[PDB]
RNA sequence: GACUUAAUGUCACGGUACCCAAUUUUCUGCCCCGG
């Protein structure tokens, strides 16, 4: 009839959309046309539509949900909505009469996707019952259909005995290496062959981008393995972290997938559980796992789509990641200068602990201490909430936060963890980036500041450390008139200095690697895109991306930012602080170090920093803060508030 | 003791279905509404119930108020210090509270002398219930030192009586589209706004703090708050089903949509339109009556069925009856008809931290209240879902999206600006002002510390409602098909809009320590002043310029909450008295309120100047339409009593001065027509208009004009007519008619009248409109908009309807001075000669008598080309341009202005005599572009052997079959596009395809003006001989003769006889049978423009050949062609081709030659007589006397006893009608032979 | 009273029903011989 001709055209369109060679942007149009034919044919036929056409719509709606990538951290409701629509479309084929076999294949595969993105609307009990119903209806045919492998192996994770179907599952060449590994682990309960096949899975994961469906299931498998208390998860999580580290190298761009953090949390927790020189090499590995996580920041797909040499590389990466999403369904750590100490912070979420990985360059010693960050995070949130309302008047809430950093991290003031005279490079993690660790006060009476003993530097990650200039001082000011008028008239400011109304082009115009660049402008933060957070310069301002692509004359330059980090990065509504400041972009474009306030501070103190920095630029920042009221948090918390704001972001 | 507390609401408060704490987690709507008023179902029917506010919610509000009160006074109330209280429970120690606080707790320095406990406690710890016998599990009310009962509604009550379900939104800031939506119940605060509850307080120590906090609670359940211590629908649906079925039996089910729109529009005309029978009746030429109001429903006309339906439903009122009948009709139509959407919108709802916020000691906390008026600067829209979909408790696989959209009103039908929409617009504009804001996360356990969210937490708005409550106007929109430039079927959709100039009460309350520079910037951005437009974009359809509101009468008063907190609490912050705050003066202010003298001006506000002011650029310009503009309101023509087929669009405007809708509606081009002209203008030059789909589309048209994923960066407002007072008659009646190709006469059913705005070249219509360009336009997209604007100026896009016959032709545009400087900075003869005919040339002294008309018996071969030329782009190989043509009259020309049947004013002395003036607009003489087009089309259809586009097929003979069966099948009018289009229908268009030539009105230029005839009562006039209906029986005498072909009329000076016969035409012929008309003279010059686009090389050449065929070939135009009137010569003054170059004569001749070859290609210095049908055509249009040749051409008289008959001629129809004198075949052969003599018949 | 709260913790004023669509395309107010 005319229905079969239209359904066959819809089927041949769905087959084209199911072709992995189809582009994702073209696949969505194809399913649109196939669903245009199928829905319109369903509109006329209504309930009298044949079951093969209802399987066709369910197949089309399964493909629809494949093209709906998560635009944020949460799984989209359109994706749920599309699988929900396919399930009630396939229910019309289940309830009205090989066809039932093809109907249950797509019903169960839709339900597997629905279960993993919506555990409440399709829980494991309901999924298990319908997965079994497909199995007893002949949906165990793994040789020609890759979906029955997913049906059976999903039942393996559900605890259903599939010993009878194991032999044909392994024999089938359509089964994935991870799927073969899951079959060995769940059915045969043998760990040697599950190791062999997972290793072939993770070896292949070095080439599949992290948006691929296989990345989520591999990490989900290790989560199952960790929750099963098996010994396989420790070796597996490290091995797939290594594949992630390899895949990350292919702008500090990282695709956001939910299981990425738990992968690093699992890999960190695996190496921590394995931690003479072997123990130390494990702690070294902890800092490399932590550094690999902070080396890049995940960008949400909506921000990736809402983004010019970088435009090409972004479009290559965004297209590659989006394609691989839908394809699944169809500097050395010890190169620190002598006399320094590097504290790598890692906040595990899988466990409640934060971990401080310190490296003493003199001792060549790796040691780590765990701390509780939950109570500290609330004290930071109290400070952040109070600062965002009262600014300087929240200096009392800064003192308790600084007292909390010294109480939650007593090892900062322990000589074994961090020696006395050593310069400390802080590589914090998540909300510890917003923590004035230099301003921490040890949990003791008349506790001294951390900066009174150690010259503190900061890094978003160890991978931002550089190796390295003129004698010119450049002032790029786009600030309000009331502030820095006296600082303008300083004679030391060079001819490249745009001392009033400086623009984005003015920052790009710098070419001679000035000894000190002083940008006094306002900061504004894109709350979702670190790349779009900008320094409020003239002619529209200059973003993080524009600094990356357009500023080339700051090689080894010391940068003083008049914009507070609170302006540059958004406030934290979660433990994560994956937002790179505009100072991170300045580090990537070769600046030796960026000095700026961590929070809003009256411009007199910022100017007092710059004039102090104008002479003897190699001055240590902590020596200034000790003599400018940093040591006085009991007496004048406002004066402790202003000096603790200044931190150095960079590394020689 | 027991305190009885009255809880009253001053705006619609939110209601939620009550679920117990355990059962509440299962529903996302109820967890969303834990802070709302609760609805229990009080029955087994789920229709009637009880509303109530839990005492836990009142207690939460009161505890929040106590925190703020004690933070204002640094932790004490009336001198007794309070500790910080407790707001953290250990899970190990005990069970957690049913509600966990996510917000920041206001804390102070606890200056209480002793730590609070069971024995002694501060008033705060008493009010919290920290140290009484009552705990997380309720046992009995005696354990509660402070107790809050459930606050019951004071008024069984049905849910639909109290609450109305409304879908709310979360619009993405960057795209302008809604991320998701969520439903809510908005309960009616005017009828069900008072809730009574008992607050028992055993500890007197906290009495003063409790009463103060009761006076301080500002909001509850989503509404402003004062806490005081003290079925015709089903029958109309069945009848609408009856009407829809009756339309289906008529095969007019598509007319049910316009019938629903018309019946809904009837609510603006009162019940008198249906009882006094004021609905239009259609023309008297059609015995079927009106095409809509005379459709038989159950054997009676729809106009009387509507009268019976109204008589049955008089009780519910006229507006409700028309609204619900039209709604039922629309819903049935949507059900039967079933653009295609695969997925619907997402209905989305929705870490234990104590965050102590300690405000600085001595910080001044004030409450600034901004009272003003929100004036609708443009027609506004606040989208509400369909009422059948929004029934609370009954809220509604195939995504059948709604096509008709309603505006948001309250129960009294007053327009409301909801607090949710005003708040969303304010958040959007504050995010613009700050330059940085969050996308609103919905389940955050941590408060968003973005500057927008920090300030929006202190901002409280109010639900605005207008006193005006007259029905909204329905704005109908169509999607044009890009390829055919016609209406896409089923693409008609409409929204209800509120009138512009409508005014709403604006209340903004800011509770903070300093008034932010950004909120002040947003208020100034929204404010309207001298030389500034209010820029409050509220609601939907901002792209079509809907909902641009202006803040006016802005007064800012600040409460001093540190020293006048008792005056604030006494006045309840004037939370229902803001309309009285706006009216009162400074002297009548309450004690705590002072005027805020510090509101900064616009130029002093950095967020305004750098973020808000440049965000939208106004491009205001005036369109000059020197043409009769007809942007038709198709529904209005169905409801106004004027019996008018096409009337100009006009809109209702509210006047705040008179507090009423202005009695005279303003004519305007709709902002949607304004928007869609630009969108096609941009899309045709970019080629984006021809794209099959726009999904995830980043094309130039999708970037500028948006799509379903991103909102438009350009917003178009209506093009208001600003000249209406200059016209003594704005509305101009113009009659058009289709002429049968064969009979040469008008089809009776094909007559139609338009009612455009009387624009003319001398007196054009000034149309002042504007659009808004968003900040961030690229240079190339800004260049596209100016190119689109220049395309409108050049006349490429006529406004409104009938642009092909010269309507809506833009004479020019005038850019206003305030337009950004960047924006305004980027904005012959035909030598051919026909040999004539042998018979008149060899006739010296003009003895032969010729028939006034002859037929073009061309062959059956019609070249119907299936590769239809698309309208969606300007094809490079095709030709687009404008032909400036000069129209010279060789004989007197008659174009009657048939709107005035008594234009010469001589029916008083000669009753029944049809007298017309020459066609004119605003006094200047014009040839309507329809007349010029229909006379080019008839020529072009004859030249190109096209189909008989206009044919009276149903007309019978006297015989076996009608003329449709008698005409050849290939000669029938081109129907549809599945079969090809003939060259005439390809060039001039069908009803399924817009023609590629537009003909402007021919303005009179120069000449002797009228034909002056002494003895005629008007000297400019000439009483014509009778113009009787053409007789096809003469052309087809027998059942075997076929249709002889296209009737053309000879060029002769037979009008001279008519002019000489003037004194005896009036006396002899009956005044009713004949007409007198103002007559133009020979040598009068008219200038008209032929605008063509996407023309082939040969089609422009054949069109140029059709315009000017030769030295001695001209056209017959207007009335009296058989009497020799209307011989008109067109010569091309200039030809221009776009991509604008003046085409030289050599290139013109190449076009004409290329058209010459296409004609011989279908046949099987060009010489046009070599093709037999063109030679016969050009003989029929050959003009003698242009040479000692004055052929005498006239019709034979009936009998010997007939006037105007010369004895002995034997020319009468008695001789010619007899088959004995001459055979029928030779009569037809002589009828199909141009210029063949008829008195000495050949 | 109960319906119908839970109490040392309710940012839901925490969320613009938003977003896309030209009421238009075609049509000469024309005109002679038989009830
Ligand atoms: Mg208690
Ligand atoms: Zn207390
Ligand atoms: Zn926010
Ligand atoms: Zn597009
Ligand atoms: Zn045709």
Numbering used by the authors:
A (entry chain C): 15 to 111, 116 to 268, 272 to 296, 303 to 334, 339 to 361, 391 to 528, 532 to 715
B (entry chain A): 6 to 160, 166 to 240, 268 to 375, 380 to 391, 399 to 444, 450 to 880, 899 to 1029, 1391 to 1571, ...
What do the authors say?
The RNA-targeting type III-E CRISPR-gRAMP effector interacts with a caspase-like protease TPR-CHAT to form the CRISPR-guided caspase complex (Craspase), but their functional mechanism is unknown. Here, we report cryo-EM structures of the type III-E gRAMPcrRNA and gRAMPcrRNA-TPR-CHAT complexes, before and after either self or non-self RNA target binding, and elucidate the mechanisms underlying RNA-targeting and non-self RNA-induced protease activation. Lacking the type III signature protein Cas10, the III-E CRISPR loci often contain a gene encoding a caspase-like protease called TPR-CHAT that contains a caspase HetF associated with TPRs (CHAT) domain, which is a caspase family protease typically involved in programmed cell death, fused with a tetratricopeptide repeat (TPR) domain.
TPR-CHAT contained an N-terminal TPR domain, and a caspase-like protease CHAT domain connected by a linker domain and bound the tail of the gRAMPcrRNA complex mainly through Loop2-mediated electrostatic contacts with a buried interface area of ~1800 Å2. A DALI structural comparison revealed that TPR-CHAT structurally resembles eukaryotic separase, which corroborates previous bioinformatic analysis that the bacterial CHAT domain is most closely related to the eukaryotic separase, a caspase-like cysteine protease essential for cohesion dissolution during chromosome segregation. In addition, the bacterial TPR-CHAT contained the highly conserved histidine-cysteine catalytic dyad typical of caspase-like proteases across bacteria and humans. The structural similarity between bacterial TPR-CHAT and human separase, including the highly conserved catalytic dyad H585 and C627 (corresponding to H2003 and C2029 in human separase), suggests the potential protease activity of bacterial TPR-CHAT. Notably, as TPR-CHAT lacks an inhibitory peptide, the catalytic C627 and H585 residues were located in a rigid α helix and a β sheet, named C-helix and H-sheet, respectively, and buried by their own residues (D543, T629, and D630) via electrostatic contacts, making the catalytic residues inaccessible to incoming substrates. The TPR-CHAT protease stays in an inactive autoinhibitory state by forming a stable complex with gRAMPcrRNA.
